[PDB]
A paper describes a structure:
To more rigorously test the idea that position of the ΦXΦ motif is critical for determining NES orientation, we flipped the C-terminal ΦXΦ (LDI) of PKINES (SNELALKLAGLDI) to the N-terminus of the peptide while preserving the sequence of the NES helix of wild-type PKINES. We named the new peptides PKINES-Flip and three variations were designed. PKINES-Flip1 has the inverted wild-type LDI at the N-terminus, giving sequence IDLNELALKLAGL. The two hydrophobic side chains in the N-terminal Φ-X-Φ were incrementally made larger to generate PKINES-Flip2 (FDLNELALKLAGL) and PKINES-Flip3 (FDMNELALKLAGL) mutants. PKINES-Flip1 does not interact with CRM1 in pull-down assays, while PKINES-Flip2 and PKINES-Flip3 show graded increases in CRM1 binding. We solved the structure of PKINES-Flip3 bound to CRM1 at 2.5 Å resolution and it indeed binds in the minus direction. These results show that NES binding in the minus vs plus direction is determined by placement of the ΦXΦ pattern at the N- or C-terminal end of the NES peptide.
The exportin CRM1 (Chromosome Region Maintenance 1 protein; also known as exportin 1 or XPO1) is the most prominent nuclear export receptor in the cell. CRM1 recognizes its protein cargos through 8–15 residue long nuclear export signals (NESs) in the proteins. The NES-binding groove of CRM1, which is wide at one end and narrow at the other end, consists of 5 hydrophobic pockets P0–P4 and is virtually identical in all CRM1-NES structures.
Author numbering:
A (entry chain D): 6 to 19
B (entry chain B): 64 to 68, 78 to 200
C (entry chain C): 0 to 376, 414 to 438, 461 to 1052
D (entry chain A): 9 to 186, 190 to 216
Write the structure that this text describes.
């Protein structure tokens, strides 16, 4: 449903 | 110790749907809007009678108030698949119980069919 | 029985009049309505003014006397100069004497303000007629009578107020230029005496009602008087101190000072600069000591709405913003004026916190003026650091949903505030974001507001700090979403996360992997049935694509293919739960990406794969609907077809010229479908009547036709290859739509046909002369007959009709030359018919077509067609243009009417019409069109406006014709004419103004 | 507890249509010009009891002007109406305001820009500022879509009563009540009604 974990992931790298 | 510093409560909502209500001006052969807002099926807890109560947005003025009589019959309108037309013999939205030919329209055919379903269920409740 | 007063043969029964009036104002229902119709008939009686002296004398009812003055007002305004000279003096003496007696009776003066104000206005109307040429001693005697009585003095201030208004504020429309200049000069020549009276009253006190009436008149003076009366006197001192302390005079004084901040002032004089600083210093001082200190919570004061607090805070805002927008530089250099400068702006900060949208817009306009100046002007921004820091919070907290107008204004000021100090802006926003997480200020409204604000300052920072900031904002927003339980709270926060990222494309473009994750997550939301999420996902998708399309079409590193391919491969799965409209947005967004691929072979391949689903659905329907056509009766098939076309429109909208390959795939079968659907609509109207057009089945069918037309219109309007448009698209199009339109009954004709043809003629009309003729033959006469019976029926057809004629007249005027004379006569009738519309959409085009037609005929030179046109239609266009110019029902078209008329008159006075415009018998030979034109117009105006003198008509035409090379002057002369026809005895010399 | 409201503005701005919407709930499509004035009682139910507006819907066309400013006498509040699709109607606002405040020197006044439901808006929001110096409340409204249609009366109610917290509340809903000689009568009217198509079938509701 609402789970932005992948966004947190890709942002924590960069 | 320190000293410190609508008449709808007796009813239950069976069905609620957004709609636009029309009344037929026979002398002009023309439909006229009466109100747009939430249309509710309200069951009295002390009589089990179901009515339609509809209020206009913002002003909250009643634009429909009548018993869902078992004798009424929902008819399709020629120019709509999301509306129902039916005769009402006693509506008190604006004072005395007056007779009206009503038409009520909804956002979709789905809402209209569901309205018809609930409308008929309500009639059988009033039948008892 | 109430109708007795309407019998003028007998004496007027004042008692009966007073009853009818009372029944109207204090009565109700039927009786009130009946009395109303009687009073109107009485007032509108042309002889009623004669009985005005009786009413004003004998009546005890103030409403009856008011109505009597209204009857007199009409008489003075329109028929004054027609009266015998005796009656003019009688009315004047009667009105003067009446006002005097009302002022002497303190009871009357106290309780009948409306009747006295009405009388004063009535006096001013006499003045506009009589003063000063027939009443030179009015002002001297007015000043004399003031000293005798406070009531008379006070009332004289009301008369002078009204006079100043009628002459300087409301004269432009209501009197001629000459007459206006006359009264302006007259007031200007005697103001020296008037001001002396006004200043003495203000300085000597002491009746507040007298003072307030004097200040009210002063407000009107400040609109036009020379600045010397304000600066070379002590009057600024009085306003900025004495009159700011009393609440009775505070409101009006503040408005006066607001206008003083707008006076014409020499900005090189240092003494005047001092004065300008002084009265501001004094005003802010009185406010701090008498009204409220700079720390006061004006938000709470305004909300309480005690007395006139709201009006006062509104007027204070207007005063501060007006003065500071002009003069703040006077306060920025002197160190001793710094406190005054910042205190003034601190009041504005407090004022900007008030919850009142229109007031906020007023302060926000000023803030914009300030921060814009600090952004360019050197050495200024450091002065306002504390003010600007507070403003950041104020704007962030009151940020509205992107009225969009107010959002743009808010964004603009906040972008400036971000440049002025980036670090402070970041700190405030992150601070606010932390208070959302600790729940101290958590709210659906408050988290949205903050997200809009954070998103508004996009592309103002450094790419590096922007990145650092965005990461901080998102990372913290991400944590906020976990914190909340229930999909209600989670949906709100998640949407704000998608909003912010969609606002920072520069960030998304630089970090592909993150951008890719964002998009895949939007596709997940396209399956969420929670209200608004699907719309939010689709809106964000296309929003991101518009800004990052290049990163979807190229093969990014660590990828085997361009991402656009990946989107298409799963497009069925992605859009499976979406509504039709949402699916169309998805496809349109794909079209945006595809159009960036500059490889033609690749672009067309991507287009084919994108349109795979609708093209298979299409192919299947076309195959089974053609055998047999019964399938179209099914509502589902009609809906499916309409959606397919709508999908083609959506993709064609973003791809334009590049859509052509896909159009060719469906074009010929699509036009066949248009024919099949058309037959069914006709068949239904035949079998059920016109009511059939209201039924869902036919409305469903007509939707198909309209979407087909929209698709073709959309492509042609954006086509780069016009050869193909002409040689492949146009002929089948015209064969499919024109005859169907012509041979349908009126209520079955789609106005979209006209609009489509307008687009065709626009782009390729110069290349299809035979086509344009065919269009006119098929739509002109039958559409005109739909709309030439009233201004009401068939509004869509009406608007598109004149758009079509307009573009045809521009692009292929030759089509009108081929018209038979009778049809060309209808064309002219149609153009004039457009003049008479109040409808803006129709009127403007009508006037433009007429103007362009005249130019078309002119360019033909001395040829038989042009000469015949003038002989037939010149005076028709002149008289028809004049009619709408003067009938007072088409004032919204004055400019274009004026232009058209100026063009028509110039033709004759430049001798562009080679043939005589008159019958060889009705005028002697050798007579120039110029002479005959004067005669025609003189005769025309004489019969149309018989109350005008021959000299008026002659002077007007003499001025009009000689000024037909100067539009602004020409229009001036027309305005003067429109004034003179409203009255009797206008001055012919007025037309010599220019 | 009733207040006189004068409604002024250019012809065709939707003054009469607006009042009708509040009276019966209908939307009149036809433009039948008002002759002089029409008085209509209009009651709202608030938390501070009922408030009654005696609305004087005046004529905007000059040839139908009637008593003109005679209608303004002893008005306690007013609405100035213009049409955001017609610049001239906004140009004339200062003129209506002028004639109004000369009779009614101190009353709450609402300035309404009607017909914001129409796409091709001509009088842009940034251009509407006349109300600022004249201390008029301003509202974008639409009689057709009911956008902000209640705001002018709510604001005026708050001003006239002197309670900024005044709100519109739901009126009480009484229980509704429950012959063969009219069986064929109502069956006639019903059949005529079914065959008469409902208006605005493209509307969202
Ligand atoms: N699209 C749209 N039309 C409106 C709106 N309000 C009124 N109209 C239309 O405007 C036209 C004029 O309406 P009307 O109430 O008679 O205006 P009026 O100001 O009372 N005219 P008058 O001053 O002559 O009495 C009508 O056709 C009406 O349907 C609106 O909000 N939106
Ligand atoms: Mg009207």
């Amino acid at each position: 449903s609402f789970d932005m974990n992948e966004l947190a992931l890709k942002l924590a790298g960069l | 110790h320190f000293e410190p510093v609508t008449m709808e409560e007796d009813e239950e909502v069976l069905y609620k749907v957004r709609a636009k209500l029309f009344r037929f001006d026979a002398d002009a052969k023309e439909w006229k809007e009466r109100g747009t807002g939430d249309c509710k099926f309200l069951k009295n807890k002390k009589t089990n009678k179901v009515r339609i109560l509809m209020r206009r947005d913002k002003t909250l003025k009643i634009c429909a108030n009548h018993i869902i009589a078992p004798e009424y019959t929902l008819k399709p309108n020629v120019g709509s698949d999301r509306s129902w037309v039916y005769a009402c013999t006693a509506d008190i939205a604006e004072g005395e119980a007056e007779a009206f030919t009503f038409a009520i329209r909804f956002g979709s055919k789905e809402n209209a069919d569901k309205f018809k379903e609930e409308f008929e269920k309500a009639q059988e409740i009033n039948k008892k | 029985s109430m109708e007795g007063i309407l019998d003028f043969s007998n004496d007027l029964d004042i008692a009966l009049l007073d009853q009818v009036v009372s029944t109207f104002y204090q009565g109700s229902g039927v009786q009130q309505k009946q009395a109303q119709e009687i009073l109107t008939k009485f007032q509108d009686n042309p002889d009623a003014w004669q009985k005005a002296d009786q009413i004003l004398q004998f009546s005890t009812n103030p409403q009856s006397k008011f109505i009597a003055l209204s009857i007199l007002d009409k008489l003075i305004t329109r028929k004054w100069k027609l009266l015998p000279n005796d009656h003019r003096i009688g009315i004047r003496n009667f009105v003067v004497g009446m006002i005097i007696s009302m002022c002497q009776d303190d009871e009357v003066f106290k309780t009948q303000k409306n009747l006295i104000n009405k009388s004063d206005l009535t006096l001013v109307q006499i003045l506009k007629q009589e003063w000063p040429q027939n009443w030179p001693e009015f002002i001297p005697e007015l000043i004399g009578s003031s000293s005798s009585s406070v009531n008379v003095c006070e009332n004289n201030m009301i008369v002078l107020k009204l006079l100043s208004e009628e002459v300087f504020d409301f004269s432009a429309e209501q009197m001629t230029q000459a007459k206006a200049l006359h009264l302006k000069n007259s007031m200007s020549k005697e103001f020296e005496q008037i001001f002396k009276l006004c200043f003495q009253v203000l300085e000597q006190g002491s009746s507040s009602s007298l003072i307030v009436a004097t200040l009210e008149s002063l407000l009107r003076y400040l609109h036009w008087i020379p600045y010397r009366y304000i600066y070379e006197t002590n009057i600024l001192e009085l306003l900025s101190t004495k009159f700011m302390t009393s609440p009775d005079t505070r409101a009006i004084t503040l408005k006066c000072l607001t206008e003083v901040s707008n006076l014409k002032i020499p900005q090189d004089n240092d003494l005047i600069k001092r004065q300008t600083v002084l009265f501001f210093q004094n005003t802010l001082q009185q406010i701090a000591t008498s009204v409220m200190p700079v720390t006061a919570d004006l938000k709470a004061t305004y909300a309480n709405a005690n007395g006139n607090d709201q009006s006062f805070l509104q007027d204070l805002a207007m005063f501060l913003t007006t003065y500071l927008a002009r003069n703040r530089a006077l306060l920025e250099s002197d160190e001793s004026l710094r406190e005054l400068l910042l205190n003034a702006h601190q009041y504005l900060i407090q004022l900007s916190k008030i919850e009142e949208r229109e007031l906020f817009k007023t302060t926000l306009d000023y803030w914009h003026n300030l921060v814009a100046d600090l952004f360019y002007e050197p050495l200024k921004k450091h002065i306002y650091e504390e003010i600007c820091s507070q403003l950041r919070l104020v704007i962030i907290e009151n940020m509205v949903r992107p009225t969009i107008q107010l959002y743009k204004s808010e964004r603009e000021v906040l972008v400036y505030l971000t440049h002025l100090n980036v670090i402070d802006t970041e700190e405030i926003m992150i601070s606010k974001l932390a208070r959302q997480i600790d729940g101290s200020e958590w709210s659906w409204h408050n988290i949205n507001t903050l997200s809009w604000a954070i998103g508004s300052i996009s592309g103002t920072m450094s790419e590096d700090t922007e990145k650092r900031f965005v990461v901080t904002v998102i990372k913290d927003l991400l944590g906020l979403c976990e914190q909340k339980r229930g999909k209600d709270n989670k949906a709100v926060v998640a949407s704000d996360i998608m909003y912010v990222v969609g606002q920072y494309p520069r960030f998304l473009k630089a970090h592909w992997n993150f951008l890719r994750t964002v998009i895949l997550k939007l596709f997940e939301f396209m399956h969420e049935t929670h209200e608004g999420v699907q719309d939010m996902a689709c809106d964000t998708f296309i929003k991101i694509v518009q800004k990052c399309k290049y990163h979807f079409v190229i093969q990014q590193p660590r990828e085997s293919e361009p991402f656009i391919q990946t989107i298409i491969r799963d497009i069925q799965k992605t859009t499976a739960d979406l509504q039709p409209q949402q699916v169309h947005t998805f496809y349109k967004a794909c079209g945006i990406i595809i159009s960036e691929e500059r490889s033609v072979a690749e672009r067309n391949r991507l287009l084919s794969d994108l349109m795979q689903l609708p093209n298979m659905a299409w192919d299947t329907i076309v195959e089974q609907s053609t055998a047999n056509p019964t399938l179209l009766l099914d509502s589902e098939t009609v809906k499916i077809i309409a959606n397919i076309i709508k999908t083609n429109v959506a993709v064609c909208t973003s791809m334009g010229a590049d859509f052509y390959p896909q159009l060719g795939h469906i074009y010929y079968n699509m036009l066949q479908l248009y024919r099949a659907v058309s037959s069914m609509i006709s068949a239904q109207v035949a079998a059920e009547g016109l009511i059939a057009t209201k039924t869902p089945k036919v409305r469903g069918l007509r939707t198909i036709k309209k979407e087909i037309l929209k698709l073709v219109e959309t492509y042609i309007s954006k086509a780069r290859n016009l050869d193909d448009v002409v040689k492949v698209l146009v002929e089948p199009l015209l064969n499919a739509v024109l005859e169907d339109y012509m041979n349908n009954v009126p209520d079955a004709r789609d106005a979209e046909v006209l609009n489509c043809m307008t687009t065709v003629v626009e782009k390729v009309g110069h290349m299809i002369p035979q086509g344009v003729i065919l269009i006119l033959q098929s739509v002109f006469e039958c559409t005109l007959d739909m709309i030439n019976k009233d201004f009401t029926e068939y509004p869509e057809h009406r608007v598109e009709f004149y758009k079509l004629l307009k573009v045809i007249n521009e692009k292929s005027f030759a089509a009108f030359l081929e018209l038979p004379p009778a049809a060309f006569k209808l064309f002219v009738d149609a153009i004039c018919w457009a003049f008479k519309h109040n409808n803006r959409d129709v009127e403007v085009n009508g006037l433009q077509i007429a103007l362009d037609l005249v130019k078309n005929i002119e360019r033909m030179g001395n040829v038989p067609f042009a000469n015949e046109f003038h002989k037939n239609y010149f005076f028709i266009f002149v008289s028809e243009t004049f009619f709408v110019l003067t009938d007072s029902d088409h004032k919204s078209g004055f400019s274009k009417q004026a232009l058209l008329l100026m063009k028509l008159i110039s033709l004759v006075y430049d001798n562009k019409i080679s043939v005589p415009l008159y019958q060889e018998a009705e005028v002697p030979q050798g007579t120039s069109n110029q002479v005959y034109l004067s005669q025609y117009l003189a005769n025309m105006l004489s019969n149309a406006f018989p109350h005008l003198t021959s000299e008026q008509i002659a002077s007007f035409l003499s001025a009009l014709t000689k000024q037909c090379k100067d539009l602004v002057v020409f229009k001036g002369t027309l305005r003067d004419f429109l004034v003179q026809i409203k009255e009797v005895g206008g001055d012919p010399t007025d037309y010599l103004f220019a | 507890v009733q207040f006189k409201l004068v409604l002024v503005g250019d012809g065709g701005t939707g003054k009469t249509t607006f009042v009708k919407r509040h009276l019966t709930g209908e939307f009149e499509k036809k433009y039948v010009a008002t002759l002089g004035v029409e008085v209509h009682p209009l009651v709202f139910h608030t938390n501070r009891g009922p408030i009654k507006f005696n609305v004087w819907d005046t004529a905007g066309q000059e040839k139908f002007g009637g008593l003109r400013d005679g209608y303004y006498i002893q008005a306690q509040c007013a609405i100035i109406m213009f049409d955001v699709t017609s610049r001239v109607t906004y140009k004339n606002v200062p003129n209506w305001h002028r004639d109004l405040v000369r009779v009614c020197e101190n009353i709450p006044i609402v300035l309404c820009g009607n017909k914001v439901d129409i796409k091709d808006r001509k009088v842009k929001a940034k251009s509407i500022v006349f109300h600022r110096k004249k201390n008029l409340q301003y509202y974008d409204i639409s009689a057709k879509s009911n956008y902000n249609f209640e705001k002018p009366f709510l604001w005026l109610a708050r001003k006239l009563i002197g309670d900024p917290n005044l709100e519109f509340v739901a009126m009480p809903a009484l229980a509704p009540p429950e012959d063969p000689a009219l069986a064929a009568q109502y069956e006639h009217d019903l059949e005529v009604a079914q065959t008469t198509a409902l208006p605005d079938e493209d509307d969202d509701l």
